[PDB]
């Protein structure tokens, strides 16, 4: 019966609550950013090439 939105929250490292969902999004955030390396469409690449 663990409940979310329990007033103030810690970081995602702690296991207070809603850490798994937050961790999954953060993990996928760089995997998309990893895909940004797979296909040469990084804005950093554009400015470094610039």
């Amino acid at each position: 019966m663990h409940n979310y939105n329990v007033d103030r929250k810690y970081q995602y490292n702690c296991r207070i609550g809603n850490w798994s969902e937050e961790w999954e999004l953060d993990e996928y955030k760089m995997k998309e950013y990893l895909k940004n390396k797979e296909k040469q469409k990084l804005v950093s690449t554009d400015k470094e090439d610039r």
């Binding site: 663990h2 007033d7 810690y10 970081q11 490292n13 702690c14 296991r15 207070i16 609550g17």
Partner: protein, 430 residues
């Protein structure tokens, strides 16, 4: 989830709390500046139990400091780890209780305790899930003996179903520095037995004996005793803060240790303890740990454990070992010391395993036990109290602030019948 708050009062309690935070911060790898500089993820997995964090990611302990004088607070804020504590939590008076239970509970503590009770309400409402309270205080001193027990009463009144911890150092007849110790001790225990769920008893002379005998260091100081007490404290909640083969929280300990509601006075000890010159000769094994655990001199209390029979025993194992070996050791010691264990309850030893040992050690065990041997402490304190009270010595300070001898007589009765019903089970047989 299941966090607990820490509140301390008096000079002795403040020192105990300061060194406990010392040990806990070192264990969790927190820079005195409040910044996490740890190395493993397990250090941060269960930090919510003892710590909150503010803006910027720095962590702060949820500790509240109370006193009637600013002498100890200014000394503890100027030392190491003195900046973790949130500054508003420093709530204190300006005059002092003057080693008087009446002054610390009726005149000055009563008027000042409103602010500290407000801030503890704030912390309890802020925390996700209050699991219990823990308090450090001394039964001898004025401000501690009064305000600690008054605040226990108020906290229990507002929170009926929570767990109360009191690591209390009782006065001793050998090492005594105050003349009116028995009065305050009796008045404190009278209110303490009524409200507190768990009470930890510690003796100054027992710590001195341990330091002189086991560690064999020539010059003990108050810092070393505080450090030993702090290690014992952390050993209790290690199992809650870290995973293990058999997890055990505070609630499980109370159920498995308390047969009847009024019998909640426990003695604690720590293993291993070795001297510097003999630390490399010893072998860290479970049988050695159990032998040192059941060693009578290892208990941090002056009670003689072999002068009475154990009701229940509990051992919390820190470090990684095998379950079967510890199980068999517990059975073996149970069979070997049947005379020192009560016979109408079977399998009266509780065992738990926590896989994270203390820093710098591969294995460690925290021991807590409930035995009739503690009656000697109350008997020796009662003997002094009645001897001083028969002549009504030093009584008009207590009677000068609304108290009367009737309250003292009632307090004596509540102590005496407690001893009687505690020793009744020693000779009660099935």
């Amino acid at each position: 989830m299941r966090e607990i708050v820490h509140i301390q009062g008096g000079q002795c309690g403040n020192q105990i709390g300061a060194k406990f935070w010392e040990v806990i911060s070192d264990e969790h790898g927190i820079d005195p500046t409040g910044t996490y500089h740890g190395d493993s993820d397990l250090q941060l997995e269960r930090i919510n139990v003892y710590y909150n964090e503010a803006t910027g990611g720095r962590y702060v302990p949820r500790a509240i400091l109370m006193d009637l004088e600013p002498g100890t607070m200014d000394s503890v804020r100027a030392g190491p780890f003195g900046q973790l504590f949130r500054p508003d939590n420093f709530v204190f008076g300006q005059t002092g209780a003057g080693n008087n239970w009446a002054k610390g509970h009726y005149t000055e503590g009563a008027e000042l305790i409103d602010s500290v009770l407000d801030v503890v309400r704030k912390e309890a409402e802020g925390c996700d899930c209050l699991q219990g309270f823990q308090i450090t205080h001394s039964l001898g001193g004025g401000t501690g003996s009064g305000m600690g027990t008054l605040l226990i009463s108020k906290v229990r009144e507002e929170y009926p179903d929570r767990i109360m911890e009191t690591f209390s150092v009782v006065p001793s007849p050998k090492v005594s520095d105050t003349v009116v110790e028995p009065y305050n001790a009796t008045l404190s225990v009278h209110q303490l037995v009524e409200n507190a769920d768990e009470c930890m008893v510690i003796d100054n002379e027992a710590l001195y004996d341990i330091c002189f005998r086991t560690l064999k260091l020539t010059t003990p100081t108050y810092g070393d005793l505080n450090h030993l007490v702090s290690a014992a404290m952390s050993g209790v909640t290690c199992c809650l803060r870290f995973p293990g083969q058999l997890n055990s929280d505070l609630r499980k300990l109370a159920v498995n240790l308390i047969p009847f509601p009024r019998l909640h006075f426990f003695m604690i000890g720590f293993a291993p303890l070795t001297s510097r010159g003999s630390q490399q000769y010893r072998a860290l094994t479970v049988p050695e740990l159990t032998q040192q655990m059941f060693d009578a001199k290892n208990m941090m209390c002056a009670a003689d454990p072999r002068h009475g029979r154990y009701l229940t025993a509990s051992a919390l194992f820190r470090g990684r070992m095998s379950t079967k070996e510890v199980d068999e050791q517990m059975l073996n010691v149970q069979n070997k010391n049947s005379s020192y264990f009560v016979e109408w309850i079977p399998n009266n030893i509780k065992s738990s395993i926590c896989d994270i040992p203390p820093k710098g050690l591969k294995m460690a065990v925290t021991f807590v036990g409930n035995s009739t041997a503690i009656q000697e402490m109350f008997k020796r304190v009662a003997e002094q109290f009645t001897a001083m009270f028969r002549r009504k010595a030093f009584l008009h300070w207590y009677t000068g602030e609304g108290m009367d001898e009737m309250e003292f007589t009632e307090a004596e009765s509540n102590m005496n019948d407690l001893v009687s019903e505690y020793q009744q089970y020693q000779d009660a047989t099935a």
